[model samples]
Target chain A: KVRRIALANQKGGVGKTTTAINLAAYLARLGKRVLLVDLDPQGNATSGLGVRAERGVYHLLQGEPLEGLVHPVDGFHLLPATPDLVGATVELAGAPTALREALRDEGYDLVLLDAPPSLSPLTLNALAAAEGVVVPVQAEYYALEGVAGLLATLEEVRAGLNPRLRLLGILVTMYDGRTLLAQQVEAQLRAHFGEKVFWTVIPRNVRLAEAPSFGKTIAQHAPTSPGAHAYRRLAEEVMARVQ
Target chain B: KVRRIALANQKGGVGKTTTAINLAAYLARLGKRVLLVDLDPQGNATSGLGVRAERGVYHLLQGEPLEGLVHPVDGFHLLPATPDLVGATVELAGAPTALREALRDEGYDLVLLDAPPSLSPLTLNALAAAEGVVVPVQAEYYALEGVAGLLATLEEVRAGLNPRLRLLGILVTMYDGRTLLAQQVEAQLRAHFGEKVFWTVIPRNVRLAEAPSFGKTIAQHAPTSPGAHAYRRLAEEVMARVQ
Candidate 1:
């Protein structure tokens, strides 16, 4: 049975795709067979892994089944993104939980969903499909700005949609070690979220922002970059937790 | 008949809630009865108008109908936010077109949905429910990042779910008078979008940020501030366009 995880955060630009792409790559780097689902219409995760977004996840969600849509790139199988996938918002709003439940029997070892940034039906589909959630938060003035709403959403989802879904971790992203504001925000997030917050802090890196344009992960684009190193650490932590 | 407007921008911190709350407030200030629906679980729109999130848009979405869920405060009515509404993500996912069809007959002169940032199912519901959309683009780099996707989705919704849906003007936020970048972005946006972009440009102001914390609109919080003046202009511009 595949262990499914959704990298989701309601707030955008909090490194959701950065974490999903890197985490999946690292898992594959460690010899785990992986499949990453690009649920976001922006398709950054799909493009970040060098996968074309013409005929992937949209086909799967639109009832083509997963076999035809799974494409291999960047060491893992990916359900890519497409411009048409943006149109799936309405159809997905009507798609059944059975769609995600069907993926459970697909023989993937690990299925990672790069969820769209919101508490929408598409995100609900991801939540319904996955076993856990990795919430990414930016270290900024409004760091705790929407955490209450996010937590409340998760609680509601757990109660109704997926009983087994767990909080994998809350990742702190865009962290600048040099900034006192970042430091304080990080501390407050840790203090408030407690164990839900991960110990691995993803440092803010120019390389990470730049790598996506090149359609490569930090690990592939700049192997020695701090972004790669942080992701590697994150993978180890995830592996340890899963094991 | 009340006009139902949904202020949406998938990009974060672009003032979706600010626009929705203020626009609704301005409409109310003009003697038009308005209902602000805080579809966002974050409840910023609900709280921004000095309303609590005890019961809100989610209850109405969950088949409770409009009469009970709408809570009035002062001049306007609000469908407050409850933690329970977050559960609607999954519940509403299976409903899709039905969600809007349910609300289409709801009586209101205007229903302003403060959607969570993203082009997802919740956004589709908001778009489907409304006859048109007010898209806010911050005058910055990548400001038009998801506009294409949003338009594509809108086209799809018009084709299948709501044939009456149309594009309301695009509002530009965070206009800095000193920066040439804002002017450049605005020009480019207008050039590309033509009449889709609105003439009202919200100035960057400290008072605008400070008002919501005190649960007041810019007009109420700092009536003499440039922020209030800009929003008043925006309200007038919106009214003119709708007419």
Candidate 2:
């Protein structure tokens, strides 16, 4: 059976795409079958996977067809992105009941959805369908800022939609070691959340941001870089939780 | 002119109450006439200001005449909170338009609303009326976790309700220096946001946390503590922006 993980943070630029692409890539590299779903219209993950967004999950969600949008990537299956996804945002607002009914049947070894940054209906659908959430929190003052609303959304989703959904763990991204403030925030976060947060923190590396633009994950872009190493550790950590 | 600044993050234990209480204290110490609105039904900020919340913002929102809910503590004025606030959640949802319009008339040099967590109507109302938002992002992996949605909500509020509202700045809270991850996160945040982010980062200190439990700001709690110094620096930085 496959575990569906939604990389959600309702906050953008927090490494959701970076995490989604790399986590799926690393899992595939580790010999786990993976399906990467680019739910955000931004198509960062779709392009990050080295594929152009011609058609994608939006079409699948609209009941148009899934076979055309789902493409095969280097290490996993990918449902690419398209500009039409922006339309889905407004469309999903009225499609939650239909979406939940549509997603009752999904098959994959490990499905990862790279969600947009908001608590809109599309996110609700992803949350409803997924078994767990991989929240990539940025390590800045404004980064962890949306945790409350997101958690509240999750709480509402758990109560109303998917009761079995669990938090895979919190992934810290874009960390820098030169500042005392970041260290202080990290300490406070650990003090508040304890074990619910992940132990592997993604360090601030130029290569991570640069990789997506080049249409690749760090695993393919620079296998030996800090980006690749951190992602690999993250993959192992996530897999360990389910195993 | 008064500025309505809401210290919101929605995540519990993310230092919302602590930030609200101390920022108000520091603003008062700096000779700025500040009004602290305890919007949380839990009344942490209400009590942190050393006042009871039985007849506060709730009564005012409920159309009752304001007679004695305002409590002057030291120098700052606090609109106390009440368990009745939990009722505002539903009421605000019904009258968001009217409530936001009401905030325009409230007189004060600075109105800091300490909002409750979650995307409830009260938070929306606070966001609707405020001219700026001060996001206190804690410095752990999950600390900067959910900010994407908050920013989006602010954007929606900006586009729809409050056009003049701007993000005052992103304040890195509970900062520590012992860890490398904190350094990485801070650098990344600065790099991503540029000048929109504040330079004064709040350090994680026992004194900062202990101050609120004792119903005081660091200026009054330990005066010479690092936390106190940082907040003072923050106050100075904030004033420079407005001035």
Candidate 3:
């Protein structure tokens, strides 16, 4: 069975797209069949992977077959996104379970959904479709502000929509080890979530920010970089828990 | 006469609040009376400056006097924000010019309005009230994604709401000099925006990230840090342009 995970946070620029792309790449490298679903209208993950599709999740929602919408990129399959996906929020309003039903048996070991940075209909659909959530948080004080609201939304989805939805873990991104505040925030997160916080922290590596510009993942762009190694380790942790 | 400027970007985590608070602090340090308006519902700017207020812009919009809502902090004034401001988006929808009417003739050399990440009614209110806008973009590939839409909104506001509104400059934040992509993104922004791009770039500094956690600005927390020095220089440039 595929373990579908939604990488979500309402806060923007906290490394959500980067985490989705790199985590998918690393999981594929670990010999798992992975599929990355770009649900964000911004299409960062879609462009970051350099996949061009005439029809994507937007068309898939409008009754297009999954085979034509899913494009292969790097080592995994991609349900790409386009600017047209912005209208999908209103189009998919009454059918929150459409994506969940469409992705029922895709024959992938793992599926990662990159959610938009807002509590819109798109996000609700992704949450309802996923079995678990991986929230990427920046190591800043304001980062904690949106987590409570997100957790409330998750609880609401679990209660009303998807009963099997669980929080896989909270992944800390953009962490600067030199800052005392980052360390303190990590401690605070661990204290609050206990074992729900992943021990693998994504460091503030320049390579991570550079990779997507070239339409490549960290493993393809700079395999020896710290960011590449960190994501690989994170994939191991994720596999251990999911398996 | 105060030059009201809105620090805005549809993308979050690009350091809009941090720039607003620090720029207000540095301008105040340079012998200018400044007011940082916390228009974002997150209240990061209000708490980041360590200001405690019983009421804020929410009350001001509801007929409360400006004097009652503004609080002094770190050599500057703040029209603080509260959780109640979130509802103001819907409440102020019919009154787009309310903020402009409320802020008229306020005695300050400069006013910085920190806008929320999304293009909502609150952002429209801020743009409708401001004389200029400073857009902060992250130094990454997807940095330019939502900017075109934001500029389109600015154009609409200028045409219909605030004709005096102008593009002040585009600020590049979280810039890592070590990354080739950062340099390329900066070049791309400069090429596209010309003089509208600020010459000063905010490096990815741990000090900038840590200051707000302690409820202080970069100037107050680490005056000698590189981030503090960069903001001081930015204030000089802003004063030169506005004056």
Candidate 4:
């Protein structure tokens, strides 16, 4: 059985995709049979890891098989998204369970879905398909503000749609220990979220932000960077949580 | 009549709220009576400026007048967002015109709406009410990926909703001049959008990102920082385009 998880945060620039891409890679590096799903139409996860496919998760919307859609990437299997995924959005508008139904219980230990920053049909599908969630929130004033609605939605999802859906933890990204604001934001998030906040905090690094452009993840782009190091530790935390 | 422009980007963390809060301040500083509308439920713009709002645009969802909701800020008037705005989202779900109808032709020179990072009902209302848009895009791998859907939505808004709506410009944000990836992203954006891309690029400045936590904009927090300088020039460009 797979421990399905979706990376969600309606707030943009919180490094959701960045965390999803790197976290999945590290999870695989740590000996897990992992699968990463790109649910965003912008296909950042697809391009971030340099996925090439003639078809994608979009095909699942139109009654296509999920077979052969998963690509073997840097140590994980990837369900990539393509440019034409807006069609999937339309096709799945009223059909939230398409992704859920299409996804079979492969023998993978973990499956991570990179949700769009909004509550699109794809995000709904990702939620319905997932058993757990990892919310990557930024360390800023509006840090907690964006999560309020997401929390509400998560509650609704648990109560109505997916009874098993639970939040794994809140991962803080783009932390700057030198800045008082970031420090305060992290403390406040931990205060509210308590132990739900992952002990691993991702630092603000230029190399990490640059990796996606070169079609590389942190492990390959700048493995020695603090950003990559934080993600490696985060993988350990996540694996422990699911266990 | 106010030139109603919205800072819209469905992609989170592209610096939309940052640009909206700071740009409106600059516009007002340039001797314009600006009304900045914090449409996002997160209330980033409201808290960014240290607004003391008992009520906000949320009040407008229930047939309340848009009067008294505007807080006098540094130089502009802010129609702030409160924590209770999720109620506004529920109220505006089917009635997108609520915002459009409630917004009267005030005497303000510029009315800038800071849209949520999603296409929520409020965003639809913002589109119907707006006369123009200023898109804030980051200079990163996923920069252009986020804007494609926004462009299509803009087209629909123009074709059916707001015919007067046109894009003011695509403002590149969080730009790192030293990064080859940022440079390539900027050059590609220019090649495609040409004149629609703003000449003034916002550099990734810590002071700018930190200002929101202190309930200040770059102008008030880091007056001489490069981020503040870029926004001042952007205001000039926006004013020039409208004229």
Candidate 5:
């Protein structure tokens, strides 16, 4: 079965887009056919991968075919995002399952949806469409504030929207080992979430932050960097758990 | 006149609360009568400073006295947040001037409003009530995406809501000097914002991240740490600019 995962966290700037783009890139490099869906109106993931389209996920939600919307970039497929997606929250308010139906017949082995930072209608659509969620958390204070709320939303979605939807794992990002707080936060996360948390932690790597501006993934930008190695390990752990 | 400033950015996890709390702490330590306004519904700044209040800014907006809502933490006073403030976005939608009226006679030397992470009605109230805005930009990719939109919002707020509001400075936070990207991003920010960017950059120090969890400021938690020093210098610069 295809694994449709939504990389979500209601908090912004927690490496959701960075994780989505790099993980999809690594999965494709590992020989899986991966499709990345940029569901954010900001279109960072879309432009981060050097892919541009007049019509993208917004058009797809508006009943456009997926064939023209999905573009290949760095060995993976991307369903890009455009500014039009800002209105998608209202336009597709009652049609949360549209994305699931649209992607049902796709041939990709894994589908990664880069969800928006807020719990709006768009995030709900991504949740309703995906079989699992990969929440990217920043290892900082107030890191866990809205998480319970998000998990509550997930439960609501499971009860009424997608029954098979499970939390695949919570990926910790922007971790700086030098900080006592980061270590403690990570420890708290592991203690609370246990197996629900991934073993690989993405560090506060400059390369990871720099790669997107140049329109390259960590694998293509600096494969030997600590950020790249961490993502690679994360990809391995993800594959092991899912497969 | 009291310098009422709003520390704001549409992006979350970029250290708005962290900056607001620490700056207020340091400013108070510098002998300034500081009022830290917890405008975010999350109440991170409230709890981060060891403050607890049943009736907070929301109650003040609903006609409660400022003395009933503002609580002292360390050296500064905090207009704390409760869960009730989450509804203020809609409750005070038609009353953008409520926050302004509430703080008009507080008599604090400085008031720092920690605005919410999104562009909502609550944040508008903070913007409308303040004389200056301090934008905290994280040193990472996609750092510049929504900034233009924020500037546009500031323009609209200035033209319509508060004509005296100005861009105080663009503060670069969570910077890791080891990375070339951090340096480059800071340079880019300075280039764009010109003299509007502050001279002191907050480093990616663990003390800043950990201080809040203990309900202590950086000065109280790890006073000699680089993070604490950065905020001290930042406070000095802010005092100089406002005076």
Candidate 6:
């Protein structure tokens, strides 16, 4: 079974951080030990989850001991994004492998690294450390555009940084089945990516962005919300795929 | 006058490329010599404008001549994102100033670097080369959160990379003032940033994403659209600030 995944995606505002936040929480709910690492300097995941850790991913990447790095949340562990991480691209130059070196998560059953949406060294480090990637593509007019760029990057990364790297699956997010345009986008995605697309489509059902501002998970904020339900299903399907 | 500004932003999908595409076009319509540099390797801006060029921003960053790097489109010039630029984060390591060295745009009245909306070398390079930054914040939950992280990076960048660098103004996009939440968010942004926030707020009234899929800009396709009008106003305000 694959133990680590770097949740990846398009240039931004896609469901990258949301999927990572909820999937890790739901997987933990399913009785698995999960460590969700906030790799983006944006700290949206860290702030949204309401986790405050002084020693975090930045320290870990700088060769700090992994001890006390993760703060146990509702049902899992979290390595939050500290603000200093904003300079990681400039400071951690020439070391795409720093994340791989730091991420020896032997105790956890699964580690999900929530990467920054754009092409940064942080994202590269995530790709280097991850055995596989969970790429979240927003269902829209340019859905394929996102994946194409990612595919090229993965080819380069797989060829050089992590030979073990592979696309675990593609998650189509923010899909509104009612819209003819979105349906068309979804059809195009499903046909092109084939079986690599995850069956669980996260609906435009999220007023889910509110949870982060409120500092809670979908499950924590609204246990019966449709967004939460989608993530739970996604967690089970991901487990099925890995197992 | 200082002439280069990099359109910077949130994790992704937050209107960085759209603003760049329109602002540059509208500025050109205002009779300024403009070069919209696509700093993101995603090529969204390049593809959106419907321009194809072999030698682009990538080659220029790697010591290629400035000659013919830009493709003339509509009324402005474009330095598109080449596919090979995706690897620049790793390959251009230790050279955060690559874009700065490459950029000596004496031919243009203004150069807007459309950044990838994350903390990447390309963005750092843009900062190194730019005199100012135009940060786009989507009016929503955690709007301030987006700016704070960016401010921290600016502080670090200012201390180390570029001393002349300053924030031009914050532009709030995707705002629908009819909603109380949006009005509150707008009010919050105004209170916090005060005079630094743009007088023009880009409405959520965009079917603007479709333009890129069709490879056109707002002015080219629907000059009468409210979104197009908002961008025109944004361009004018930017001119007032820079000039």
Over B1-243, each residue of candidate 6 has an lDDT whose tens digit, in order, gives: 569998897675647788899998889987899999998888889999987767788788677777567788879989888888887778666788888877878988999999887778888888888988999888886878888788778878888988888889888887753454665576677667766777666767546757777778887876756567567657767876786
lDDT of 5 at B95: 84
Interface RMSD of candidate 2, in Å, is: 12.8
lDDT of 2: 0.72
Q: Please, what are the lDDT tens digits per residue for candidate 6 over residues A85-170?
A: 97767865688988887786898999999988777888888888898888898887686878888988998999998898888899
lDDT of each: 0.73, 0.72, 0.81, 0.81, 0.81, 0.80
lDDT of 3 by residue, A39-153 (tens): 9888899889877776788887877877777888778889999988988788678889878877744688889999988777888899999988999988776666677678888
Provide per-model DockQ scores: 0.01, 0.01, 0.01, 0.01, 0.01, 0.01
Instruction: List candidate 3 stretches off by more than 4 Å.
Output: A1-243
Give every collision pair in model 5.
none
Give the TM-score of each candidate: 0.49, 0.49, 0.50, 0.50, 0.50, 0.50
What are the per-residue Cα lDDT tens digits for candidate 2 across B1-243? 327887776474547677787788778877788888877778888777667546888777777654466788757888888888887787688665545565533556788888777867777777777778887887665544556567777888889877877788777787664454665576556556645666667767787878767776666777666566557557656665665
Badly placed stretches (over 4 Å) of model 4 are A1-243
Model 5, B3-92: lDDT tens digits are 899999878673878999899988897788999989888898999988877888888888888876778788988889999998777877
| Regions of candidate 2 where Cα sits further than 4 Å from its true position | A97-107, B1-243
lDDT of 5 by residue, A1-243 (tens): 438999999785738889999999888877898999999888989888887788888888688888777888889989899988887678678888877776753678999999988777788888999988999989865666656667888999999999988888888899764555775686567556666777667878788989999889988898767677567657766876686
For A73-117, candidate 1 gives per-residue lDDT tens digits of 778888887877777677767663744755643566788988887
lDDT of 2 by residue, A98-192 (tens): 44455422566788878778766767778887878888888766545566567777788888878877888777777664455655565455545
Backbone clash pairs for candidate 1 read A53-A81, B2-B108, B2-B109, B2-B110, B3-B109, B3-B110, B4-B111, B56-B80
**C-alpha lDDT of candidate 6 relative to the true structure:** 0.80
Residues A137-227, model 4: lDDT tens digits: 8888686877777888999988888888999988888876445566557667856766677766787888998988888888888876657
Q: Between which residue pairs do clashes occur in model 4?
A: A12-B12, A12-B13, A13-B12
Candidate 2 CAPRI grade:
incorrect
